Amino acid sequence: KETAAAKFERQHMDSSTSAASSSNYCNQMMKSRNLTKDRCKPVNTFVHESLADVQAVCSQKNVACKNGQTNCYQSYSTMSITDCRETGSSKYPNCAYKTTQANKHIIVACEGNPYVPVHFDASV
Numbered sequence: 001k002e003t004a005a006a007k008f009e010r011q012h013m014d015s016s017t018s019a020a021s022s023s024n025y026c027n028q029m030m031k032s033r034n035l036t037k038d039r040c041k042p043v044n045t046f047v048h049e050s051l052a053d054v055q056a057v058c059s060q061k062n063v064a065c066k067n068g069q070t071n072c073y074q075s076y077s078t079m080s081i082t083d084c085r086e087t088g089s090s091k092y093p094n095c096a097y098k099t100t101q102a103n104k105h106i107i108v109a110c111e112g113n114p115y116v117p118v119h120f121d122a123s124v
């Protein structure tokens, strides 16, 4: 069983590139992070920042999670992110994603000891 933290890392961390530099980025990364194995995962954000910078957000701005839980934090600064979202012509096992690169505040739910991100809630 994957831990909540290790799963957050696999689904949401891309510290190896500063930004999606091509429209194929989401197709490539959704497959290589194993988010197209069973089904096509509809929506997924990647963060182009150090793991340490993303972990740090857990002691930044405490805000409500959109499920009404109170263990969510908004990053004080903007961060390089890529939105991956299935297009109309996506059908498992031929998953097709739209790649939208952006610079936005991230909101993560944090849990545990150490107190680390376990869910990507949104970016603003």
Ligand SMILES: [C-]#N
Residues within 6 Å of the ligand: 119, 120, 121
């Ligand atoms: C989505 N947590």
Ligand SMILES: [Cl-]
Residues within 6 Å of the ligand: 003, 005, 006
């Ligand atoms: Cl872990």
Ligand SMILES: [Cl-]
Residues within 6 Å of the ligand: 010, 033, 034
């Ligand atoms: Cl995996």
Ligand SMILES: [Cl-]
Residues within 6 Å of the ligand: 043, 044, 045, 120
């Ligand atoms: Cl996401």
